[PDB]
Symmetry: C3
Subunit: 150 residues, 3 copies
């Protein structure tokens, strides 16, 4: 099975930036009702999508207390619980983060380490790449992810 997911958030100077489950030193951060971690949302949607389960807005509406104020790893782990319950064995996650600043290369090892631990995948099965927007979206972070299961 395969699943494809996307996320994006506007970025504001002076707000914390969460990506891949980590808080990143940065002059900008997501301006969103949640932690705005585009990487974990895209991955969560891709996982849900691989089983036709819906999307993060459907399964994690802030309307439910279980979801209100929570770090995005809560949503990812719930999506893994759901697909695992359906027989899935996650094999790979490959995703692209688009953002102009900050540079994520200095944080590559920690970002991949975090995804590896969160999704319980070997490091060679975490495919993380970074790009700028070349001016197309200078005030947003964007993430697009594919997952492979079985």
């Amino acid at each position: 099975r395969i699943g494809y997911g996307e996320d994006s958030h506007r970025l504001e100077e002076g707000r914390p930036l969460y990506l891949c489950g980590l808080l990143i030193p940065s002059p900008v951060g997501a301006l969103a009702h949640s932690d705005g971690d585009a990487a974990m949302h895209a991955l969560t949607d891709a996982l849900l999508s691989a089983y036709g389960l819906g999307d993060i807005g459907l399964l994690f509406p802030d309307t439910d207390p279980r979801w209100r104020g929570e770090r995005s790893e809560v949503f990812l782990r719930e999506a893994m619980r759901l697909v695992e319950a359906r027989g899935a064995k996650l094999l790979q996650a490959s995703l692209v983060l688009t953002l102009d600043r900050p540079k994520l290369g200095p944080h590559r090892k920690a970002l991949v380490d975090s995804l590896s631990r969160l999704m319980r995948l070997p490091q060679d099965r975490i495919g993380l790449t970074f790009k700028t927007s070349e001016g197309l979206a200078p005030s947003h972070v964007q993430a697009r992810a594919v997952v492979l299961l079985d």
Copy 2:
């Protein structure tokens, strides 16, 4: 086999919105020579791509009488005919629709039912997720699709 496809259309107020084969009640809709069904087009391109057959512009030009003014499901069905003639067995489709409004959640079941009927896939093999553009693309609909075959 895998295939990857994308489509996008300018939205304009007061035009009909078509997604996944259905009319969706909406304040806005595609500004196009097509019905502008971004989901249908992205899936068609994904299917063609999986066999290297070209893209919707090549295969379904409106300079072609069989395809001019036709609904986009006609093109999806012809793309399925072509890949099935080459021995394909579609397994799964996962796609993301990006649009600010209207909300697609209230139409989720009908949209997934439509793709399941049209591609003859079980509901758990239709992975449909929705997102807004968080202000990045307020006047467009975008779709990106992955298909898996054999």
Copy 3:
């Protein structure tokens, strides 16, 4: 294994346009320190991503004299060397190029022929599709690519 990669480049009038390894006659071309071949870059990042090896800015930075000023096919061939040494067999590449002008349809045969020759894949395993940005990104070329291996 699967990998997903993206690239984009600003377009400017009177610069040469490189796509899939080829010069494309065009009013506009990449503004870049590289040849700005978005197709090559997205495919390279997708291959690297499939083994968790990093991205083109990590492996092929222009701070490294070995890679500065090289054509983008050089990087793609080295990515192919790296995954092959890890046991990979590339099976398929599917990618989408987004750009308003020039029209790529007249170049379709040559582009596909080039990717087939470069990746050593049969034409039915090169899935190339083209789209405009519909006004969303009129001064950029964008590429998004999925690869499948083993």
